[PDB]
């Protein structure tokens, strides 16, 4: 484990330093998250890993005068125990006797204690829950503005500050000026004077900009404040002065004043927000996400604070316009070309005995990089053979890197960001003869996949109402999968994007409408044996029906992912005619669209593979 | 219309009377609801009808110095306009230009106005929404303790105060002492000192008592406060002194003190709650429903107020024990006997031309009353032929009472309270030859009904996740129904009971578990032509499956309703084998269970009908 005895000594001393706290605090909370509720935390924000040695993706540390405790989930019980030294106490989340953070605190704190946390990195949700319980026991939760880990972290990496990319109308369908105008119409109809934007993907979409400050998600560290007559963009770096960016943002015009973007330092967000709020008149509202940091939300006086589950940006960007959806189609056509090359290569090379989980993942990236306007992977590839495939959240380590073979089911989940769009696809396959049980499970999963993709439903049906269609065949045999059926997908933006989706986990998802894009990804995982998942990105599209009730219209799903589904894995005699017709048609569509592209790109061998793999059942 | 000019004059004067208000109020709100959020409002509480002349089931009146406005929904636009005189302004809810109550108020009120409402008859939800908007415009929402309509309502009927009925262990499965003990264990594990019970069905279930103060729902006006060491029942009437009731409630013992029920006047609820709250120490909590009246909730100081979506009584009573579920089976067997007699009678009598929607409803009640321990109808019968059937909320009027015929689809939805249990059943039928479209729609509805009833799903699946199964066949052809698929059902208690159910309207319903009872009732309504609904009460039951994932087990539904589904209405060639087998089996189960009962009861003619109507397809 990392030796953290001296780090803890220094942190405990910082907890008492008058420069940071008016009075000493008896406990300090170090969460995983960053200031924007990011999905992938930048190295500079991996404070919990720094103080503990535990560097998994999830975990909350709490340091007291006497104790250092770490809460993490099942993925990490073993990792945390190994990585942390004897200073640390492991709190195994999910287990029956594991105390909550707040109840643990009450049990270890002396009378009338102060508990500190950096307010920029927790939401109000968490603040309220913690503050309540602590207050009951005579304690106080204190926002400590200076991050205490940063104070002791001598060799803390700089915040990533990478180039910006501009996206033109061909890609976005609508200008940033028009997006801001649309947003202001929504603000006016609600007496909102100011809208504070804290989610990095929302800022990227609003200004038609992209970046690479965060892994996978093509976003950049920033905030924005939108007024009715002004715009304030909080961003660091000379990147903002690149000629393409100046031109795109109209920064060297003598333009109309309401579209003049004021560029402020990234650190200035709270002080500029405080100054605007100081000047509010009684009925004036400030819109903020209910997901925003406590520091940002608390800056807005309660009387003026208009919290919302989903900002109007989240709602607008959920529906892809024709430029965006055409980009998604293009991105998927390129991605399928790359996967035809990959799967052909796998069929040739796996029997030779040298293909490993990592080398196959490497090869997937290699083929993707050949395609025009490839940017990066949209998430880390999952490449799992045999028992590894049952581990839903499995990520490579060289010492448990398995060799692909003719005797094990292989699952590959992978995806890319292209300038045109964003992909996410899982296929499960076998290189010789699968067992009947492997085929049985695959076929239940496929039945669910088709039940969702072929579903016809009224406009405005919430996606969660499609989730059980994916599960019916599994459920009938006593099987299930412990994940959601689908999520929204961004347009050259986060592969995991709300507010639409298909899950049993929420009823508050947005009604499905034409232009939304989601995944359809049922699976089945047999611990110690194999895993199966069949995942496509699908576009919500209008569809004509026999009858027309209550007006409104109906919708169905159209796959953008065009990659064969391996027929040897299917118990064909168990399919309905509808399912058989669906797969045959899907396969001919793959052959049409991807085959044309393969021929255009001169990729004969991959085209031959695609034709073999798209034969009817 | 009713002449309400003088009533309004008197109400306007009451709004300024120092005996009722410290200062005059400029507006007064008169809602539909009563103090317990009852489903069926007692005549004495029909205040909105009294002041306006409009006596539909839904509507909110607001009286100002200058205006009298009525908000109601689509069912009642015509009724309200006809029943109210020229003093009244109709506010058509749902329509685009119809203002909300609170925005209408701001538009008609003078500066710095007070708006009054009786706090006993609105929830905090409504109070908060109204108070906020009014406060913004410089106005104040005032709780006015003395109901102002009652002050002017000279011939107001007395509150119903009907006999109480006791239910023994054979019916309830568990004593009230044991229910109170269970509730107290839940209170202790939450540091709750007091639990205020405001829902009439919860009080009935807790004390194993029933009544008839409210139409249909077998409940009695009361409140209860449960402490850890005391019980307080707020109830009026010498009914509490009936020997059976004294014995049941252990009121003439020298019993252990924690089960001594203190009987207080019904009106004393607020003053006794205020006195208990005066004595709370800092960390002591009082449990109240978030549905409770503002008057009750506000009595509890905010620091001590522990609001909950579902009380622990609501959660416990949702799961029927074996005594309760066996009662439900018995009640359904009796109800089916009555319906076999009814449907046989219909087949004989409709061709003679004298059967009307009302006479058929009357006959349904007549046959039910023959059965042992019939108590009353569980809701008003819906009896609709032809176009009436498309009107989801249709209730008889003698001048639109249609004659049943050989040329129209007939829908009958009916149900009873028996001492043993509660029923709710819809059947749709035809007395000669239906059209292909009528059969097409019926078959889509039946497919949905079977998809739900035959569903197999993991324990703890939320019922809302079954809703789309009922709709798939309709949806595929562009049809739908604008109501939920099912609701929970009480045990000799409200036919409409949560917190479980099957609806697109909520994601916050409770996970399904063995012992819950719900309806399965898809339909289809063709405006100006016909309606179809096929409704059974079903019990959630365990079921063995081929495989066993994640432990937990699986569940399915077992119909308690045993009434034939008419095969002439079905496009049989369109059914799957699963659906055909389901119906054949269901019909033989009807024949077994109900046939045995008919034979035992000596009902030969009805038995002959049942055998004809349960032949295989
Ligand atoms: Ca084999
Ligand atoms: Ca006919
Ligand atoms: Mn994926
Ligand atoms: Mn995915
Ligand atoms: Mn009914
Ligand atoms: Mn019903
Ligand atoms: Na999930
Ligand atoms: Na409904």
Calpha distance B188→A34 (Å, rounded): 39
Going by the DSSP 8-state scheme, the letter that residue B27 receives in this structure is E
- Phi, psi (5° rounding) for residue B538? -125, 145
- With the CA atoms of B463, B466, B468 and B474 taken in that order, what torsion angle do they form, in degrees rounded to the nearest 10? -120
Calpha distance A522→A54 (Å, rounded): 32
Calpha distance B284→B261 (Å, rounded): 22
Report the separation in Å between the CA atom of B600 and the middle of ligand 6, taken as the mean of its atom positions.
29
Report the separation in Å between the CA atom of A324 and the middle of ligand 7, taken as the mean of its atom positions.
26
**A595 strand-pairing partners:** none
Counting the structural domains of chain B, the total is: 3
Cα of A536 to nearest chain B Cα, Å: 22
Please give the biggest Cα pair distance in chain A: 76
Which of A317, A343, A370 is a domain's end point?
A317
Cβ neighbours of residue B402 under 8 Å, at least 6 residues apart?
Answer: B356, B357, B384, B385, B386, B388
Calpha distance A15→B129 (Å, rounded): 43
Count of CB atoms situated within 10 Å of the CB of B527? 11
Which ligand gives the minimal distance to the CA of A502?
7
CATH number for the domain spanning A399: value is 3.90.230.10
CA–centroid distance for A345 within its chain: 30
* Residue whose C-alpha is closest to residue A412's, from A471, A354, A348, A364: A364
User: Residue B313: how many CA atoms within 13 Å on its side-chain side?
Assistant: 24
* Residue whose C-alpha is closest to residue B294's, from B37, B24, B576: B37
Going by the DSSP 8-state scheme, the letter that residue B119 receives in this structure is G
Residue A84 near residue A52, CB atoms below 8 Å = yes
Please give the biggest Cα pair distance in chain B: 76
What do you get for the CA distance between the two ends of chain B, in Å? 55
In terms of domains, do B249 and B327 share one?
no
Which of A317, A344, A374 is a domain's end point?
A317
Residue B501 near residue B461, CB atoms below 8 Å = no
**Closest-CA residue of chain A to B504:** A465
Strands A536-543 and B261-264, by their bridges, are: unpaired
Calpha distance A532→A512 (Å, rounded): 27
| Chain A residues touching residue B554 (CB < 8 angstroms) | 475, 478
Going by the DSSP 8-state scheme, the letter that residue A163 receives in this structure is P
* Residue whose C-alpha is closest to residue A11's, from A40, A59, A44, A52: A52
Strand, helix or coil for residue B12: helix
Report the separation in Å between the CA atom of B588 and the middle of ligand 5, taken as the mean of its atom positions.
23
**A233 strand-pairing partners:** A224, A263
Q: Do B479 and A455 touch (CB under 8 A)?
A: no
In terms of domains, do B227 and B371 share one?
no
**Closest-CA residue of chain A to B441:** A547
Beta-strand ranges (E) seen in B309-454 are: 374-377, 382-385, 410-414, 416-418, 421-422, 425-429
Strand, helix or coil for residue B489: coil
Calpha distance B397→B399 (Å, rounded): 6
Residue B438 near residue B568, CB atoms below 8 Å = no
| Chain B residues touching residue A466 (CB < 8 angstroms) | 468
| Chain B residues touching residue A501 (CB < 8 angstroms) | none
CB-based burial label for A23 (10 Å; 0-12, 13-18, 19+): exposed
A499 upstream amide cis, omega within 30 of 0: yes
* Residue whose C-alpha is closest to residue B606's, from B305, B335, B272: B335
In terms of domains, do B385 and B502 share one?
yes
In terms of domains, do B127 and B166 share one?
no
* Residue whose C-alpha is closest to residue B37's, from B125, B154, B163: B125
Asked if A543 is an interface residue toward chain B (Cβ–Cβ < 8 A), one would say no
Calpha distance B80→B89 (Å, rounded): 10
Q: What are the DSSP calls for B184-235, one per residue?
A: HHHHHTTTEEEEEE--HHHHHHHHTEE--SSSSS---S-EEEEESS-EEEE-
Cβ neighbours of residue A52 under 8 Å, at least 6 residues apart?
Answer: A2, A4, A59, A61, A68, A70, A83, A84, A88
| Chain A residues touching residue B468 (CB < 8 angstroms) | 457, 465-466, 468-469
Report the separation in Å between the CA atom of B209 and the middle of ligand 1, taken as the mean of its atom positions.
65
Strands B223-227 and B209-210, by their bridges, are: unpaired
Calpha distance A510→A502 (Å, rounded): 10
Q: Do B469 and A472 touch (CB under 8 A)?
A: yes
Q: Do B477 and A550 touch (CB under 8 A)?
A: no
Q: Do B458 and A477 touch (CB under 8 A)?
A: no
CB-based burial label for B449 (10 Å; 0-12, 13-18, 19+): buried
List all residues of chain B from 274 to 293 with a beta carbon under 8 Å from chain A: 283
Calpha distance B417→B256 (Å, rounded): 35
Residues that place a CB less than 5 A from ion ligand 4: A 424, 519
| Chain A residues touching residue B457 (CB < 8 angstroms) | 468, 471, 475
Resolution (A): 1.6
Which one of B457, B507, B550 has the shortest CB-CB distance to A507?
B507
| Chain A residues touching residue B504 (CB < 8 angstroms) | 461-462, 465
| Chain B residues touching residue A511 (CB < 8 angstroms) | none
Asked if B475 is an interface residue toward chain A (Cβ–Cβ < 8 A), one would say yes
Experimentally, the structure was elucidated by X-ray
| Chain B residues touching residue A436 (CB < 8 angstroms) | none
Asked if B467 is an interface residue toward chain A (Cβ–Cβ < 8 A), one would say yes
CATH number for the domain spanning A147: value is 3.40.350.10
Which one of B465, B477, B506 has the shortest CB-CB distance to A468?
B465
Residue B337 near residue B598, CB atoms below 8 Å = yes
* Distance (Å) of CA B318 to CA A445, B4, B296, B379, B542: 33, 44, 25, 20, 16
Going by the DSSP 8-state scheme, the letter that residue A527 receives in this structure is T
* Distance (Å) of CA A423 to CA A212, A219, A426: 17, 16, 10
Cα of A547 to nearest chain B Cα, Å: 5
| Chain B residues touching residue A461 (CB < 8 angstroms) | 504
Q: What are the DSSP calls for A170-206, one per residue?
A: HHHSS-HHHHHHHHHHHHHTTTEEEEEE--HHHHHHH
Q: What are the DSSP calls for A96-142, one per residue?
A: TTPPPHHHHHHHHPPTT-EEEE-GGGSBHHHHHHHHHHHHHTT-EEE
Q: Do A550 and B466 touch (CB under 8 A)?
A: no
Cα of B462 to nearest chain A Cα, Å: 8
Cβ neighbours of residue A549 under 8 Å, at least 6 residues apart?
Answer: B478, B479, B480
Q: Do B468 and A469 touch (CB under 8 A)?
A: yes
Going by the DSSP 8-state scheme, the letter that residue A465 receives in this structure is G
Asked if B503 is an interface residue toward chain A (Cβ–Cβ < 8 A), one would say no
Cα of B449 to nearest chain A Cα, Å: 15
Q: Which residue reads 């909110």 in tokens? A: B60
In terms of domains, do B340 and B291 share one?
no
Report the separation in Å between the CA atom of A483 and the middle of ligand 7, taken as the mean of its atom positions.
4
Residue B106 near residue B87, CB atoms below 8 Å = no
Annotated binding site of B for a peptide: 75, 393, 487, 496, 521
Cα of B506 to nearest chain A Cα, Å: 7
Calpha distance B118→B149 (Å, rounded): 10
Strands A223-227 and B457-458, by their bridges, are: unpaired
H helix runs in A480-524, sequence order:
none
Calpha distance A223→A197 (Å, rounded): 6
Going by the DSSP 8-state scheme, the letter that residue B155 receives in this structure is T
Strand, helix or coil for residue B349: helix
Q: What are the DSSP calls for A359-420, one per residue?
A: HHHHHHHHHHHTSTTEEEESSPPEEEEGGGGG-TT----GGG-PBP-TTS-EEEEE-EEETT
- Phi, psi (5° rounding) for residue B479? -110, 165
In terms of domains, do B563 and B499 share one?
yes
In terms of domains, do B144 and B262 share one?
no
Report the separation in Å between the CA atom of A551 and the middle of ligand 2, taken as the mean of its atom positions.
29
In terms of domains, do B284 and B329 share one?
no
In terms of domains, do B66 and B84 share one?
yes
In terms of domains, do B425 and B468 share one?
yes
Paired tokens of B128: 């908060």
CB-based burial label for A506 (10 Å; 0-12, 13-18, 19+): middle
Cα of A315 to nearest chain B Cα, Å: 20
Calpha distance A584→A594 (Å, rounded): 15
Strand, helix or coil for residue A235: coil
Calpha distance A441→B471 (Å, rounded): 26
Quote the domain boundaries for residue B341.
318-617
Calpha distance B212→A428 (Å, rounded): 62
| Chain B residues touching residue A283 (CB < 8 angstroms) | 136
**Closest-CA residue of chain A to B546:** A477
**Closest-CA residue of chain B to A552:** B478
- Phi, psi (5° rounding) for residue B382? -100, 120
Q: Do A550 and B482 touch (CB under 8 A)?
A: yes
Calpha distance A455→B468 (Å, rounded): 10
Residues that place a CB less than 5 A from ion ligand 1: A 433
In terms of domains, do A594 and A575 share one?
yes
Report the run of H or E that residue B179 belongs to, with start and end. Answer: helix B176-188
Count of CB atoms situated within 10 Å of the CB of B400? 9
Strands A261-264 and A285-289, by their bridges, are: unpaired
What per-residue string of b and e applies to B465-474 under the rule 16 or more CB within 10 Å gives b? bbbbbbbbbb
What per-residue string of b and e applies to B103-141 under the rule 16 or more CB within 10 Å gives b? ebbbebbeeebbbbbbbbbbbbebbeebbebbeebebeb
Of the residues B307, B479, B511, B577, the best mutation for testing chain A's interface (the one with the most A CB atoms within 10 Å of its CB) is B479
Sheet hosting strand A88-92, strand order edge to edge: A88-92, A68-72, A60-64, A27-30, A114-117, A140-143
- Phi, psi (5° rounding) for residue B474? -65, -50
CA–centroid distance for A529 within its chain: 28
Which one of A283, A467, A546 has the shortest CB-CB distance to B465?
A467
Count of CB atoms situated within 10 Å of the CB of B240? 18
Calpha distance B133→B114 (Å, rounded): 13
In terms of domains, do A253 and A354 share one?
no
Report the run of H or E that residue A426 belongs to, with start and end. Answer: strand A425-429
Cα of A457 to nearest chain B Cα, Å: 5
Residue B321 near residue B174, CB atoms below 8 Å = yes
**Closest-CA residue of chain A to B506:** A507
Calpha distance A421→A560 (Å, rounded): 11
* Distance (Å) of CA B37 to CA B57, B222, B315, B378: 13, 12, 18, 18
Residue B225 near residue B194, CB atoms below 8 Å = yes
- With the CA atoms of A165, A168, A170 and A173 taken in that order, what torsion angle do they form, in degrees rounded to the nearest 10? 110
Cβ neighbours of residue A502 under 8 Å, at least 6 residues apart?
Answer: A452, A463, A464, A466, A467, A470, A484, A485, A486, A487, A518, A519, A520
Which of A119, A153, A187 is a domain's end point?
A153
Which ligand gives the minimal distance to the CA of A485?
7
């Amino acid at each position: 484990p990392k030796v953290t005895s001296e780090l803890l000594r220094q942190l405990r001393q910082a907890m008492r330093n008058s420069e940071y706290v008016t009075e000493p605090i008896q406990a300090y909370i170090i969460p995983s998250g960053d200031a924007h509720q990011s999905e992938y935390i930048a190295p500079c924000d991996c404070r919990r890993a720094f103080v503990s040695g535990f560097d998994g993706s999830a975990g909350t540390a709490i340091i007291t005068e006497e104790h250092a405790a770490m809460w993490t989930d099942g993925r990490y019980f073993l990792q945390a125990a190994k990585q942390m030294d004897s200073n640390w106490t492991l709190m195994k989340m999910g287990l029956k006797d594991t105390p909550t953070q707040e109840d643990w605190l009450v049990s270890v704190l002396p009378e009338g204690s102060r508990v500190g946390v950096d307010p920029l990195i927790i939401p109000t949700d968490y603040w309220k829950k913690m503050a309540k319980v602590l207050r009951s026991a005579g304690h106080h939760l204190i926002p400590v503005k200076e991050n205490l880990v940063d104070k002791i972290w001598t060799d803390r990496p700089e915040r990533p500050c990478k180039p910006l990319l501009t996206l033109g109308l061909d890609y976005t369908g609508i200008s940033w000026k028009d997006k801001v105008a649309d947003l202001r119409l929504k603000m006016a109809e609600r007496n909102v004077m100011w809208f504070v934007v804290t989610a990095l993907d929302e800022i990227a979409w609003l200004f038609n900009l992209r970046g690479s400050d965060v892994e996978h998600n093509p976003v950049f560290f920033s905030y924005a404040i939108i007024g009715l007559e002004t715009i304030m963009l909080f961003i660091d770096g000379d990147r903002i002065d690149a000629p393409s960016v100046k031109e795109h943002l109209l920064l060297d015009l003598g333009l109309e004043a309401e579209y003049r973007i004021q560029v402020h330092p990234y650190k200035s967000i709270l002080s500029e927000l405080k100054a605007l709020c100081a000047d509010l008149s009684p009925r004036e509202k400030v819109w903020v996400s209910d997901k925003a940091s406590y520091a940002v939300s608390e800056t807005i006086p309660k009387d003026h604070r208009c919290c919302m589950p989903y900002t109007p940006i989240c709602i607008a960007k959920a529906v892809k316009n024709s430029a965006e959806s055409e980009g998604m189609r293009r991105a998927h056509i390129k991605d399928a070309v790359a996967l035809c090359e990959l799967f052909n290569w796998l069929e040739k090379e796996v029997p030779k005995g040298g293909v490993t989980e990592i080398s196959a993942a490497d090869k997937a990236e290699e083929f993707r990089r050949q395609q025009a306007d490839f940017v990066d992977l949209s998430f880390p590839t999952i490449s799992s053979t045999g028992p590894t495939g049952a581990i839903i959240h499995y990520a490579p380590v060289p010492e448990t890197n398995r060799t692909l073979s003719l005797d094990e089911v292989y699952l590959i989940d992978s995806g890319a960001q292209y300038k045109d769009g964003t992909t996410d696809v899982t296929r499960t396959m076998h290189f010789e003869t699968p067992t009947a049980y492997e085929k049985e499970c695959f076929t239940y999963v496929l039945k669910g996949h088709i039940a969702v993709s072929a579903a016809v439903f009224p406009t405005g049906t919430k996606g969660h109402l499609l989730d059980s269609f994916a599960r019916s065949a599994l459920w009938d045999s006593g099987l299930d999968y412990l994940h959601g059926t689908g999520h929204g997908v961004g347009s050259f933006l986060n592969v995991h994007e709300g507010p639409c989706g298909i899950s049993y986990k929420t009823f508050s998802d947005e009604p499905l409408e034409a232009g939304m894009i989601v995944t359809d990804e049922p699976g089945y995982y047999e611990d110690g044996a194999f895993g199966i998942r069949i995942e496509n990105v699908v576009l919500v599209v209008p569809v004509k029906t026999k009858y027309n009730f209550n007006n409104r219209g109906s919708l169905t799903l159209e796959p953008l992912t065009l990659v064969p589904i391996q027929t040897k894995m299917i118990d064909v005699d168990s399919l309905t005619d509808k399912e058989c017709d669906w797969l045959n048609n899907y396969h001919l569509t793959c052959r049409d669209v991807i085959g044309k592209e393969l021929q255009k790109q001169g990729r004969q061998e991959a085209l031959e593979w695609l034709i073999r793999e798209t034969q009817p059942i």
